[PDB]
Every structure is written in C-alpha cells, then in structure tokens.
C-alpha cells in the first residue's frame, strides 16, 4: 500500500433547505446548534457515516473496500476474522505477545477495511487489535451565520395501537433548519497515511465520497442537502509549507451583493478563494 | 431546615433558579442523556452572568412548550422564575468559592421542594 | 445501625456529605488511585465553605456516568446528598477542633451505612 | 555541542476551536477547567508531549536526537543501554559509587536524548541513572476568558460484542470548547544548558517545535488548534536583566474593537507587545 | 569584623501561578496549609534553600562565599576540614578544651561560609565545630488569603519495568496552588552580625538573594514565582528603635477593587506601606 506523499487541506461548503442536517440526542433530535451564538452545527462523525455510505455503496464490498463500522455488524466477530486471518490466538483482553503479531494484526485490519485506512479506529475491546490514528480528520461543520431551527407539528391519521383514549389522531413534529450553509475544515496527513497505507486511489475516492455525499443520503428527515464549494490545499512536501489556518483564512464566505434578508439559497452568499503560498497548490474540485 | 422563600440571597437565588430551570427543562425535553445540570452546573456558578443569559433565553421556549399542551405545572414555572429573577438585582460576571457553596446549597434546596407533591 | 439520620448537627451532616461523595466517586471510577477523601480531606475540613462546591461539581459528574446504565443506583446517592443538604443553612468558614472531630465521626458513620449490604 | 549564552523568555499563543485541547482524566475527559473562575487549562506535560511529537517526526531518530519517553519504551531498557554504553554495571537502585562514574552515565543519555536534554528527566528507578532539571521550563498554559465545555452527545452504528440486546445502536459523548485563546510562559536558563548541553541548535529546533506544534497532532476529539503569536525576550547576560513576571505583562490580550458576544475566532482578540527593557531584546518568531 | 552598624526588618512578597510553592512531606506532597484556615504555608528553610541556591550561582564559590549544607556534601567531611585548618586534632564529640581553639575553628566555619556567617548553623556532631545561632533570620511565609491545592491527573506514555497489562499505562499526579500571594517577615540581628562578621557587602547580596531568589528556581512542579515587593526597615541604632510587629503593621495588604470573584494576579491586591516611626527608616524602591 504505496501511501500518499504530500499534505492536504480542504475545506467543503454544503448547505441544507428546509431539512435537519443533524439531529441533537439530548435536545430532542432538534438540529446541533452553538447554544450561545445559535451558529449550526454538524458533528465530524456525521460526515464520516456519510463517506462510509457513500464508499459502501460505490464499491459494494470490494476485498479491499470493506467498511468496518456497518449496522448490522458485531466488532469483536470482526476482530476474530483478523486474529485467524493471521493464524494467531486472541488471548482474553490484551495484544498479542510480540510486536510484529501485533503489527500483523492492525495491518490486516487496515488493509481490508476502508474506513480504518482512512479515519482510524479504536479496536482495543475484548478481542483487542490495537488503535489507528486516522490520516483523515474532519472538525466539526459550523455554518456560516445563525441558523433558526423550526419545529412544525403533524398528524396521523392512524393509530399505532389500540388505546381506549381514541380519535387519537396523535400530533408528531420535525425539526427542520430553514437555510443553512455549512463550511467544513479538514486535514490529511502523509506521516499518518505511511503508517496505514493510505493511497492515491483511497484519496480520489474520498473526494469523490466528499463531492457526492450526499446525493444518495435523501430521506424524510433531511431536505435538500447538496455540497457547493470544495477546496483542495495540496502541500508540496510531506509536511507543510504554510499553518492550516492559514490557508482556511484564503476561503472567504460573505453575503452576496444585495442580499438583505435572511438567508435562503446559495445564491445569497458570495465565496472568494485567495492566492495561496508558494509551496502550497490550490485546487477546486467543485 | 429546608428551603427559605425569603433568604434573598444573591447566589441562594441564582440556585433555585437554576433548579427550577433544570425542572423545566426536564419537563420540556425529556430523555436527554445530559441534562442542563450536567452540562453547565460548574459554569453556571463560576460565571453566572455568561450562561444564565443563555440558559433563560432558552428556558422562554421551554415553559412555552408546555403551555402548549395541556398540562400546567408551566405557569407555576414561570412565576418562580420571574420571582426569583425580580429578587436578583443583577448577575455577577464571577462568584468567589463560598458563594458558590451557597449557589450549591441553594439549588439543592430548591430541588427539595420541586421533589415534593 | 449507628449512624443517626436525625441528628442534623452541621459538622456531622458535612461529614455524612463526605462520605456519600466519596462513594459516589469509589462507584464511578472504580479502582481509582486515590479516594476524593486523600484528596480533599485536609482541605475540606480547613476550608469547607470554599471547597464542597468543587466536590459537588465532582459529584454530579459522578452521579450522571452511574445514571448512564443499569448498574445506575445514581438516584440513591442523588436523594443522600439532597437530603443531607436540605438541612445545611449555610457552609461554615471555619471548623473548631470538636467540629472537626464531629465531622470524622459523622464520615465515618455514614461510610459503613452505605456498606450495608 | 556548546551550550546556549543567554536566558530566554518566551509567550505563546494558541488557541482552539470546536475540540477538546487538554482532556481530564478525573472529571470524565472534559476540558481541564479552573474550576472556581471557568478558565481552561492545558497542562505543560500536554505541551511538553506535542513538542516531543514534533521533534520525533522532524528528525526521524537521528542520532542525538532521540526521545526519552516514548509511546510504549521500557525505560530502564534504556537505563540499562546508557549503563552498557559507559560500561558499567547497574547496581539495583543505586548510582555507582564514584562520581565520575555517575556523571558519565547522567551524561550519556543527556547527550544522545533530546528531550531529557532540553526538559530533564527523573531516572532513579531500579536501574538508577540520576535526574535531571533541564533548562527549559513551561507554566501551565491558561485562557484569557472563560470557556463553556460543550458536552456532545452522538450515536454508534454498530456493537462492540454479542449480548441480549446487542446490530444495535450505542451511546457515546464528545467533550469540545467552542472556542479558547490560551497563553503559555516558558523559561530557558543558561546554567541548567551548560549542565546539560542544551545549545543553540537545539534552541532553533525548540523554536520550530512551538511554531509548528499543532500541525501534526490533529485527531478526531482536537479539533482545529493553531499557534498565534511567539514572544520571545533574550537577555544580553547570562542570569537576566529583568524580571519574568516584568516581560510577560509586556504582552497584553484584550477583545478587539466591536467584539461584542463571547469569543469565537482569533480576530475577536488583540494582542499587542510593550517596549522591552534596556538589557532585553523581544523577537516575535510569529 | 566590621559587621553591619543597624538593626532591620523587612517584608517579602511573592506569589506563584498553578504552581507548588512548597510541598509537604508527610501528607503526599500537597501544598502545606494552614489546617485550620486554609492559608497557603513555605517554610523558613524553602526560602532559605533559594537564597543559598541563589549566592552559590552567583558567587560560583568564591573565597568566602561557599555553602555548608551544599547537596548531598558529608558535614563531618567539612569540620574536618575546619579542624585541619587550625592545626587541631579533632576528640571523639567534644569541641577543643581551650576556649580560644574553640572559637577559632568556629570562626573559620563562619568566615569560609557564607550561609553558616547568615542564617547560622548546628555543628555538633562527632567533629564539633560548636553552633551559630544566625544574623539572619525568616518566619513562615503565610498567604494573604485562603488556598485550595488541586490535585492534576497526569498520564504518561511509558513504562518503567514491566506494565501490569503486560487501556492506561500510568496515572501521575501534580499539585498546584491556581494563586496565592504570600508575606514573610524576616530580622536581621546587629549584635549577632558581630558574632559572626555578616558585614554590609553580605547584606547587599542577601537583599540581591531576596529580590532573585525566584529567577533561577524555575522547575516543572514550581509554576511561575516572583517576588513582589521588598519593604526594609532599618534602625538608626544597634539595637533598635521600635517593635517589630509595629513595623510589619505599616506593611498593609488588601483586596483591590477588582474583589470580584477569587485573586488570579497580583494586581488584584493592593499595597500600601505607612510611615515609619522617628527612629526607623523604611527603603521600599526593591
């Protein structure tokens, strides 16, 4: 697995209309928001299960495209399928005895799931595998300016069980965000991909996961949900010619020339891309 | 021993509010893994003027919720906010330790009595 | 059993609060290097007023991870810390040597409730 | 190697956004916290660590530039490598006897490890090999305003082992600070390098570890962290001509003009350095 | 001997950030406080410790400028040394029969070494070179306001031997003290000057000591330390002029106007010296 040889940055550019890009768990699945300023949010894990989707569904279980985080999947069963794959004998909670087992071990894992190769895992369980860094990292998405989740009520018109309160045309609610858009900052690192073998080809297929994720990602809760803008920083070196801040600071996202309202498209918001330093390369995939 | 409707204590007040934004909240949006205490009882005592902004702008929607359907505690809610926050001159920017002891006392005091019937 | 629900003397419940924080955190971070008593004892009693908010902090924190599954109690401990609190008016600035005395005994007695099969 | 002539102060300053900088591993992982004022906190062992990070990266184990504590080492293999190398032999607990003798092995390791070269070590184990101060010195890094720790809760698609109700859907939490500047004082003594040899090429490479500090240790839960601004005081003699508490108060953070709600990007904060005194020369490496 | 001419007094303060200013022994190695008020404690014999580290660094073992206690030094060692001197031979416990011997072998001890002519010593060993009761002297170093020590859970990513899983592999531990400043009261005795010969370039260097003492202790446990303020009284006469509690009151410190919340900087108390009685003038520019 020849890795890839230079450093990455890029920033993606979605927006959601009328939809939940994110359900809160404790704030009764209403969209993720930043409780003092009211900014949207959308955690990192989101748009990985998004790439793993997306992964899953182009390459349908290729030998070396399996996804190791599945719904229906238990990670210990899959730990074990690694432990015989290398012949070896999973002792109750700890890595095998000597090192290069171990090595064998987690670059099995790596090898044949995608998603290890590409943003790490955690498979110190009970069929312990080791850990993997991740090359790929995301942050968090925060939208550009504040966002005002709804809560619209609907009805149904039938009945889940029989109850003796009945009509109980029961009362349901979604929460949708009526506009947002979201930018997202990630960073891909050559030292890290060398320890798992991240390659070029796994590269071009996470831009195209990025660019096409959420195409097939439609659902009820959701509306339209698309990615506008994605900006790739290529580093000319394994390590970087310029900090990470610097050049997310060359995207430039503000409000289109006379637009006055609230925001309600793409169209309201105008996007600039600056000059980048001179051992750094710049390119648009969208 | 027990709670005191009438310490008009700055940080005794600024613990029964927030017990009784905790209730509401609870009411509200019930399931939460996290409740507003788990997510901001130390903040709320050490910077009471920066959260308990927030906190009380959220807590509007909240009791308005459950105005809406038809149970009513939240009226009872919402005058114990106001009471307290009318026997609140204003929200310090920070609190020494011992006034958060007693922040502490008060809130646990007031989530006695919300316990109650 | 010798602990005495009853007895509402300051020094005595603040020890029982001790020691009820002390399991709260013994249950959630088992086989922890040291106890919140090695950590906080001397200052506790030195300085009580300025520091059982920072153990209550710790706490709830505790309480909420037990909440978390069903070996959850977190409702027992919860209920202790609110019923003891309930009869503190207000934390002391200072101990006397007796004080302190009292609270080692009221620690004490509360521990080996709460050992109680 | 001849050690460094002169003593050094230096500020940094970093800060993050959306991600946990220093979790605790008492109050579950959140943020360190003061916890009577709500300022963060990052230790400077956490620092200490990334600058180890960097180094070990940049200079990939050359020799002289090894590092001391390192992820799963056995130290008194080490120990017991510096007590080879000197030729002697280890007794149990114990430096030996002459004090020559002791020198030479403190020295050995304090020559061929960067990292206890420039931030000294504790090695009294059973394979006794002395300590060392180490003239580079870091205060816990500490933020300008309160932070709020957000608690994030977010979900599992899978089940880490077969059970009754486990294929199943888990719960998991994220701690981040929505956003924080944070200051760090450092210290460099002139005699504690000649004790160890600590010199001017080390310096340069402990000034490119600060500048780049951030840029290779991004993780799922550090979200986008980044180094600001690096104020460093050289004094013309070897014991100082000010105070360091005198220098430090030169650098001055305070909300920007129109800065309003609480912070959430740098530019919310401006930073500006005072005129050093007479026998101090103040450099800004960024 | 030309020892000093007046009597004095002075006051010392200094503060530490998220430091250990001084560890207690027996109970682990919290800060020591006061434990029935929560007042931060040092020991005379920590400041006592800087200033000696303080005059070996910058004396460097000049002639008459040595330090008895040193480090890990054999006191019998340096009496014999004494002894030798004198062309004496030194009994089993006892000092020399002749009263003029045994003042001379003292009187080496106290005009070869500077910390024996300042704050004293206990010589009675098994080569008695008497006992010095100290020009010099320091109370404990007590905090304006109560402390609260945190403990700070710190991992390490090494093993010393064997790891007991061979999940963590180390759980350190630090105190720190997040502020507190602290007054020490101290004397200075004319008529033991003359017993010993503290003369006045003595002095000047232990009111050097006492504004430097901090500069060079940096360490990783001790935080950031600085002294503040340095009021010295000295009297017209020999034996004085007015109490010493009488001076000390003139020294007032008091929470400034910025009392809100707790004190996380010196300028958060504020410093005022009164004046002094007719026969005592007080110098306060250290």
């Not at chain 2, 509200?28 to 906190?55: C, E, W």
């Amino acid at each position: 697995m020849t890795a890839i040889a230079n450093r990455y940055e890029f920033v993606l550019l979605f927006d959601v209309e009328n939809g939940n890009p994110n359900g809160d768990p404790d704030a009764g699945n209403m969209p993720r928001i930043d409780p003092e300023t009211g900014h949207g949010l959308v955690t990192d894990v989101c748009l990985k299960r998004k790439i793993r989707n997306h992964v899953a569904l182009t390459k349908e279980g290729a030998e070396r495209f399996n996804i190791y985080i599945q719904e229906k999947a238990i990670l210990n069963e899959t730990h074990e399928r690694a432990y015989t794959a290398c012949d070896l004998k999973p002792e109750p909670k700890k890595l095998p005895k000597k090192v290069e087992d171990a090595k064998r071990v987690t670059d099995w894992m790596c090898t044949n799931f995608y998603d290890i190769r590409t943003f790490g895992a955690v498979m110190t369980t009970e069929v312990n595998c080791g850990q993997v860094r991740g090359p790929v990292q995301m942050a968090f998405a925060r939208s550009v300016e504040p966002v005002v989740p709804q809560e619209v009520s609907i009805t149904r018109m039938a009945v889940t069980t029989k109850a003796e309160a009945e009509d109980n045309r029961t009362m349901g609610r979604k929460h949708i965000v009526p506009y947002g858009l979201y930018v997202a900052h990630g960073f891909i690192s050559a030292p890290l991909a060398e320890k798992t073998g991240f390659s070029d080809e796994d590269l071009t297929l996470f831009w195209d996961a990025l660019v096409n994720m959420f195409e097939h990602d439609r659902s009820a809760a959701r509306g339209l949900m698309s990615s506008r803008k994605l900006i790739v920083f290529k580093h000319q070196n394994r390590l970087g010619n310029a900090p990470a801040h610097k050049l997310f600071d060359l995207v430039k996202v503000s409000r289109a020339e006379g637009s006055s309202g609230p925001a309600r498209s793409f169209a309201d918001y105008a996007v600039t891309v600056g000059q980048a330093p001179e051992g750094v390369e710049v390119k648009e995939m969208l | 021993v027990s709670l005191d409707p009438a310490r008009t204590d700055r940080p005794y007040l600024l613990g029964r509010l927030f017990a009784v934004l905790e209730k509401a909240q609870e009411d509200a949006v019930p399931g939460a893994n996290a409740t507003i205490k788990d997510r901001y009882l130390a903040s709320a005592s050490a910077n009471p003027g920066q959260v308990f902004h927030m906190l009380l702008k959220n807590a509007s929607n909240h009791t308005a919720k459950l105005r809406k359907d038809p149970e009513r505690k939240a009226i009872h809610y919402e005058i114990m906010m106001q009471e307290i926050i009318d026997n609140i001159s204003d929200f310090p920017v920070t609190m020494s330790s011992d006034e958060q002891g007693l922040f502490m006392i008060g809130y646990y005091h007031q989530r006695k009595a919300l316990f109650t019937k």
